[PDB]
Structure formats: C-alpha cells, structure tokens
Design a protein around this ligand. Structure first.
Ligand SMILES: NC(=O)c1ccc[n+]([C@@H]2O[C@H](COP(=O)([O-])OP(=O)(O)OC[C@H]3O[C@@H](n4cnc5c(N)ncnc54)[C@H](OP(=O)(O)O)[C@@H]3O)[C@@H](O)[C@H]2O)c1
Ligand SMILES: CCCCC[C@H](O)/C=C/[C@H]1C(=O)C[C@H](O)[C@@H]1C/C=C\CCCC(=O)O
Length: 319
C-alpha cells in the first residue's frame, strides 16, 4: 500500500475499500467481504450511516483485530454524517450512533456526506404529501463547527467533506474563526469525469480529493441510466489493460494514484478484492496518463436530476 499525509498531520492509505452494497445483498456479506478486504491488504475502509452496514463493517474490523491480523491504529475507518443531521445539534449524536453501531471508540475520518441538507429526522429520505424529498436550509459552516467539535472530543481523528464543489469548499475555508480545514473532499471521479479543475483547486489548499465510483459505479438501475457508457468497457482503458497486462479497473485505479487522488474501490468478489490491491504493482507512463485524461465527458453516473433544484446542488458550477 502507501499513505498520504493529511493537512491534519494524520495519514490516509491511498487505497480504500468501498463498502456500499444494494439493499438486495444480505448484510452478512458486508461482514464477510470487509474481512476479505483486510486480509487482502486494504487498510482504509469507507462506510457511512446511509449504507446500513456500519454494524457489519465494525464487526469485521473488530474480528480482524481479535484475529491478531491488525491493530485498531492500522485501520483507517471513515463514516459520514447523513444530510438529515446537518443541524449542528444533531452532529455529535449522529456520530455517536455510528460509533455505537460499529462498536468503535473513534472514527479515523468523519465526513459531511453531501451539502444538500434534508429535513431533520430519523428517516433518511423525507418526502411530503406529493412524494417529493423535503429539503432543509442549514448554514453548513455551523454544521462544520459541530464537526470540529467532534474532532476536539476525539470521536473523529480527521474531518472532511463529500460532494462539495469549489464554492462550497471556499465557504468553509473562508469561515471566520475556522479551526480545522477539511482534510479531503470525496467526490465522484473517474476517466469519464476526472474533476481536474476541482483536483487542482483542492491541491492548492492541501485538501485531498478522494475518488468514488472510480471503477464506473455499480450501475444501480435505480439511479444509473443503463444507457450511460460502461467505464470498464472503454476502448482506451481496455487497450491500456492489454498493454500493461492488467485490467481496466486497475488502469482506472492507477490513473488516480498517479495524479494524486486517493481511490476507493468497491468489490464484494473475493478474487476482484485481491486483484484491486495489485494497483501498487505497476505504473502508467506519462503518455498513458494523457490518453486517459482525454476520456473526460462530464458523465456523472448518479442520476442527480431530481435534486437539481436543491439550493446546494453541487453541479450548478463549472466545478
Ligand atoms: N460519498 C459519496 O457520495 C459516495 C457515493 C458513491 C460511493 N461512495 C463510496 O465509494 C465506493 C465505491 O463507489 P461505487 O460504489 O460506485 O463503486 P465502484 O468502486 O465504482 O464500483 C466498481 C464496481 O466494479 C466491480 N469491480 C470492482 N473491482 C473490479 C475489478 N478488479 N475488475 C472488474 N470489476 C470490478 C464491482 O463489482 P463486484 O462487487 O462484483 O466486484 C463494483 O460494483 C462505495 O462502496 C462507497 O464506499 C461514496
Ligand atoms: C449530486 C451528487 C451528490 C449525491 C450524494 C449522495 O450522498 C449520494 C449517495 C449515495 C451513496 O453514498 C451510496 C448510496 O447508495 C447513495 C445513493 C443515492 C441516493 C440515495 C437517496 C435516498 C436517501 O435519502 O437516502
């Protein structure tokens, strides 16, 4: 593996394990594959309240610690604050609940899952009488103040954000009396949506860009148009796969590592989980990288059109 030093002083393994799996998959699977991931060499594990799996992921971690395979400090665990808990008073309590579910003392990284606040409540997707998801108006800077408090209280070693654009990031960065800068910004990032501009900006403020859907997403027919191009079927990626004798997924992952992006990779398949750790075994040439750079088509796999009306919709800006 390898690590990147956060503007926190803390370290984040550049390769992370994505734990989300559709509700159709047995929750016992999350437990089994997280163990497989750790056994394969994954040290960074990505979860969230929304995934309904923190109990299982924490179970796997606890199990591998008892195994003697790893120590708590060897694992980098991240969870995320769901959008229905943006009001400052619901932040610590939300974190405490995640910690309780995972049976952990602290989270290595806690993130604001998305800038699009939703009506407060236990329900993850609040909708009105007309079936429309209910938005909420919250000063994200106050949400951030509550996050900084969680870090001071030792519940989260590092704090960051997710799905934020440059303007939203700047809101935090320019907040009067700011104590902690977000350590990262976890966003959708892959060759068909490489986020070069955002990447350059984050790099300029020492903020780490963490890539999700780096392998082209899980293409859930619920939020992903089946007509969208299949990333792992890209001719250039496959050509580079056949050239380096690797796989399109490894090419996509290596692309991010070489451009300074921390990459997440979800897989509930034993062989693929183990294959993904091989991303550290090869290297792409400067020319290889330029070729992948030319693949961008501003394609966002998640169908976010329904929230396009949200005042905090991140895709309103060029980046
Ligand atoms: N903060 C956010 O808003 C946000 C949003 C989305 C996701 N995330 C996080 O980032 C993670 C990754 O994103 P994602 O869920 O879209 O998944 P992804 O990593 O883009 O998914 C890659 C898909 O390709 C397959 N795959 C994995 N390794 C492969 C390999 N070596 N060769 C061929 N196919 C391979 C997997 O299927 P198999 O399981 O069959 O291997 C997986 O479904 C999530 O699990 C989650 O932790 C965060
Ligand atoms: C415009 C881009 C911002 C979208 C950010 C958003 O957090 C994305 C979340 C996705 C994950 O992390 C995995 C998970 O399946 C989830 C899928 C998408 C929407 C669930 C909305 C329903 C609810 O309310 O629960």
């Amino acid at each position: 593996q390898q690590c990147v030093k956060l503007n926190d002083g803390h370290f984040m393994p550049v390769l992370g394990f994505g734990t989300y799996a559709p509700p159709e998959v047995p929750r016992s699977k999350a437990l089994e594959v997280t163990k497989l991931a750790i056994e394969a060499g994954f040290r960074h594990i990505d979860s969230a309240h929304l995934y309904n799996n923190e109990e299982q992921v924490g179970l796997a971690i606890r199990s591998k610690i008892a195994d003697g395979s790893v120590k708590r400090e060897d694992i980098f665990y991240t969870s995320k604050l769901w959008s229905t808990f943006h009001r400052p008073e619901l932040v610590r309590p939300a974190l405490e609940n995640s910690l309780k579910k995972a049976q952990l003392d602290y989270v290595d990284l806690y993130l604001i899952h998305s800038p699009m606040s939703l009506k407060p409540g236990e329900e993850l997707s609040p909708t009105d009488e007309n079936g429309k998801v209910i938005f909420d108006i919250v000063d994200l800077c106050t949400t951030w103040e509550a996050m900084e408090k969680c870090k001071d209280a030792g519940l989260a070693k590092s704090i960051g954000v997710s799905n934020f654009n440059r303007r939203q990031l700047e809101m935090i960065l320019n907040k009067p009396g700011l104590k902690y800068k977000p350590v990262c910004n976890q966003v959708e990032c892959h060759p068909y949506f490489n986020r070069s501009k955002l990447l350059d900006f984050c790099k300029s403020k020492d903020i780490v860009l963490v890539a999700y859907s780096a392998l082209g997403s899980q293409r859930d027919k619920r939020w992903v148009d089946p007509n969208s191009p299949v990333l792992l079927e890209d001719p250039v990626l496959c050509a580079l796969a056949k050239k380096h004798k690797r796989t399109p997924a490894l090419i996509a992952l290596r692309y991010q590592l070489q451009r300074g992006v921390v990459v997440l990779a979800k897989s509930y398949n034993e062989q693929r989980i183990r294959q993904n750790v091989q991303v550290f075994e090869f290297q792409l040439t400067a020319e290889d990288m330029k070729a992948i750079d030319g693949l961008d088509r501003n394609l966002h796999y998640f169908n976010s059109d329904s929230f396009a009306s949200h005042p905090n919709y991140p895709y309103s800006d060029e980046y």
